């Protein structure tokens, strides 16, 4: 029985039990609200433990094609690589997608399966109903035909990465010929070039390609299409790009960290803010290693050693 047989082999459970579980599985989500950083809330639906294990086993079993321009949910690749792809460049065209994860329906996933340019696992027609139960979330209890991908599920990142394999391939192919580098952190397309007046023609290409591939289901967020250059602030997915073509945390965050270290110097920092500063300095060491050396010079090596890791 193909997919269910493999899931039983990996999960050490009977095929019948797994098949019985994957009947109301799209309804097996607990939805909760996480706070936004400024104001409001974000609705996240997280599957139950059993469905989570099923999704993890499924994604480990079947490897879908992903593009090298995708820097999100990839092993060995992350925020720093995405920012450093455009570290040496002058103009940039940060763009966004409109409700990316919730716009991926089973129809989109199955359509992208059959027209993929790369190798795709062969799925029997018997297990195509079970795949939808495994992967997709069913947000309205009365409507059973509304299935969407939910951010917060283990399977959703790789499914969303694969659903834009062809989009990434076509965009990269059409974009490298005009000397523009392209990346995507799974919802946030980044373009940059050293040639002026070439990025202004990119959003139309993105719109027409999205219409060609996903039809009306997936679309750009026209309010989130931002042009920038060295005359203005330049940041890619959280990392500020300096006018010296180097990655940085920004002046404001680096002064915030300096204030935190100065507070810790005089014992004005409690346990929670101390842990927050140790976490932020680990992140700063990852992104901008020279900041750690500069803080060692400014606040002495002994104080930093007492705060940061000792062993």
């Amino acid at each position: 029985m193909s997919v269910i047989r493999g899931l039983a082999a990996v999960l050490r459970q009977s095929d019948s039990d797994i098949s019985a579980f994957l009947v109301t599985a799209p309804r097996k989500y607990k939805v909760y609200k996480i706070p936004k950083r400024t104001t409001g809330f974000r609705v996240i639906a997280q599957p139950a433990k059993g469905l989570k294990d099923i999704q993890r086993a499924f994604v480990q079993l079947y490897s879908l094609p992903v593009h090298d321009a995708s820097m999100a949910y990839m092993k060995g690749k992350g925020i720093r690589d995405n920012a450093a792809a455009h570290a040496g460049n002058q103009y940039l065209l940060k763009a966004d997608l409109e409700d990316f994860f919730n716009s991926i329906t089973p129809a989109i996933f199955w359509r992208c399966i059959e027209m993929s340019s790369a190798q795709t696992p062969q799925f029997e027609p018997q297990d195509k109903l079970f795949i939808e139960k495994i992967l997709f979330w069913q947000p309205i209890k009365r409507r059973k035909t509304k299935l969407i991908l939910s951010v917060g599920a283990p399977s959703s990142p790789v499914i969303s990465n694969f659903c834009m394999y062809e989009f990434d391939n076509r965009i990269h192919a059409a974009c490298k010929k005009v000397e523009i580098t392209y990346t995507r952190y799974a919802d946030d397309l980044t373009f940059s070039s050293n040639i002026p007046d070439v990025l202004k023609a990119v959003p139309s290409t993105l719109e027409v390609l999205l219409k060609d591939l996903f039809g009306s289901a997936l679309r750009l967020n026209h309010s989130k299409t931002v042009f920038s250059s060295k005359a203005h602030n330049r940041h890619v997915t959280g990392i500020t790009i300096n006018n010296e073509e180097t990655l940085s945390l920004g002046r404001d965050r680096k002064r915030f960290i300096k204030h935190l270290i100065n507070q810790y110097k005089y014992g004005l920092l409690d346990n929670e803010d101390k842990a927050y500063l140790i976490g932020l300095l680990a992140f700063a060491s990852h992104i901008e290693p020279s900041f750690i050396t500069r803080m060692n010079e400014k606040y002495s090596l002994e104080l930093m050693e007492r705060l940061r890791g000792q062993r």
Partner: protein
């Protein structure tokens, strides 16, 4: 959580500070306070802080204006983007190029700010599903995206107004939450401690209708502070409301004898000075109570005449200036000069009914009277453009079909240039 909000708020974030204030207030005898004295004080100081520059004009520390507008399948525009200036933006072009459409979209966006200032969760105006969607659009929906700036602590306030065409199964929602949040901040802070409120006004072609003093039982109370938001984006400023308010001020001043000085007299004097300074022909305005119906009289070219004997052009401009001055005075009680309050004012065809002599100074007078107001104006005249900087002008190409992405400034400096040159180029 609490600590992230505290870290953002102490860094200058207005939204986080307001969130902290509301939460801490909730616990009346618990953690927090009434003026949270940290969070409420920071919010009110953010809204109220400012300094007088070298020219004697009060400048708010965190200015409020509209940064960007995107129009998607709205009227004739497939996808248009504008980069309005902080102080003055002038949109020019041929007839039927979409300037009035842009002003209409901006007014529809500002109606949500006005509605949520007036009421909690109030609903503003919405795009029409019969005439606002582009006729030959394939998608059958329209978007009007905007971004507002309210200082470094609130750099982006995105609001999107959307409407699907009539008889379309799939409807499009509007993202109006950030405007509601900003107006909630304004209203809640104002309730606890009075603060200066922004002025949003639209002056369409719908103005310049005849004016007769037919407004007696007009239901609403013109002294009430929040009457300055009533019909303020309808297109025709309520000049009858101004007449009632002015007569009320005159009555309170003539019937009177913290410093035993009436603030109504100060408001009346400020409005009088504004009207006399902006309108060229009008030299002095007052209220006559003998011949015992109340009458407003102005001095036109040295002749005392009544308010309904003004010409079309001295009465329309007077109505605009008087309405704007009244709303600014009522919405800025803590300012030494209430006309220096902030806000967004849209004027359609500013040269309407005006002689070329008056067009040479309308923009300068308007900007001198209201220095912190962001004016977004359309015009059909080289004379008005000769008094306006090149960077403030957004021109439509003469061969546009609506598929232009970004409106631009002309390549020729218009300020101080001859009228023939501006006409030709």
């Amino acid at each position: 959580m609490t600590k992230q909000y505290e870290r953002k708020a102490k860094g200058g974030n207005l939204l986080s500070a307001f969130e902290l204030y509301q939460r801490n207030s909730d616990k009346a005898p618990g953690l927090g306070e009434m003026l949270v004295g940290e969070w409420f004080e920071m919010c009110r100081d953010y809204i109220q802080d400012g300094h007088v520059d070298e020219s004697g004009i009060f400048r708010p520390d965190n200015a409020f204006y509209l940064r960007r507008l995107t129009l998607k399948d709205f009227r004739r525009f497939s996808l248009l983007e504008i980069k309005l200036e902080e102080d003055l933006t002038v949109i020019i072009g041929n007839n039927g190029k979409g300037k009035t459409s842009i002003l209409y979209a901006i007014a529809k966006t500002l109606s949500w700010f006005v509605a949520n200032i007036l009421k909690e969760g109030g609903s503003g105006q919405r795009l029409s599903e019969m005439t606002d969607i582009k006729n030959d659009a394939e998608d059958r929906y329209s978007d009007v995206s905007s971004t507002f700036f309210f200082g470094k602590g609130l750099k982006s306030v995105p609001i999107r107004l959307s409407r699907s065409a009539l008889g379309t199964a799939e409807r499009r929602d509007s993202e109006v939450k950030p405007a509601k949040d900003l107006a909630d901040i304004w209203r809640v802070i104002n309730e606890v401690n009075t603060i200066n409120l922004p002025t949003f006004a639209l002056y369409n072609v719908e103005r310049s209708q005849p004016f007769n003093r037919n407004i007696k039982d007009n239901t609403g109370r013109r002294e009430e502070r929040f009457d300055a938001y009533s019909q303020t984006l309808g297109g025709a400023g309520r000049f009858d409301h101004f007449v009632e308010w002015y007569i009320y001020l005159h009555k309170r001043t003539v019937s009177d004898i913290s410093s035993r000085v009436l603030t109504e007299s100060v408001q009346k004097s400020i409005v009088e000075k504004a009207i006399c300074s902006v309108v060229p022909s009008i030299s002095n305005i007052w209220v006559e109570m003998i011949t015992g119906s109340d009458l407003v009289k102005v001095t036109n070219d040295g002749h005392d005449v009544t308010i309904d004997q003004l010409s079309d052009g001295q009465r329309v401009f007077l109505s605009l200036v008087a309405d704007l001055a009244r709303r600014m005075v009522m919405l800025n009680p803590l300012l030494e000069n209430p006309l220096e309050g902030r806000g967004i004012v849209l004027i359609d065809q500013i040269e309407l009914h005006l002689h070329p002599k008056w067009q040479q100074e309308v923009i300068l007078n308007l900007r001198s009277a209201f220095p912190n107001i962001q004016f977004i104006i359309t015009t059909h005249s080289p004379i008005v453009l000769s008094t306006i900087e090149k960077r403030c002008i957004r021109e439509f190409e003469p061969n546009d079909d609506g598929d232009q992405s970004f409106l631009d400034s002309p390549d020729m400096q218009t300020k101080g240039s001859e009228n023939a040159q501006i006409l030709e180029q």
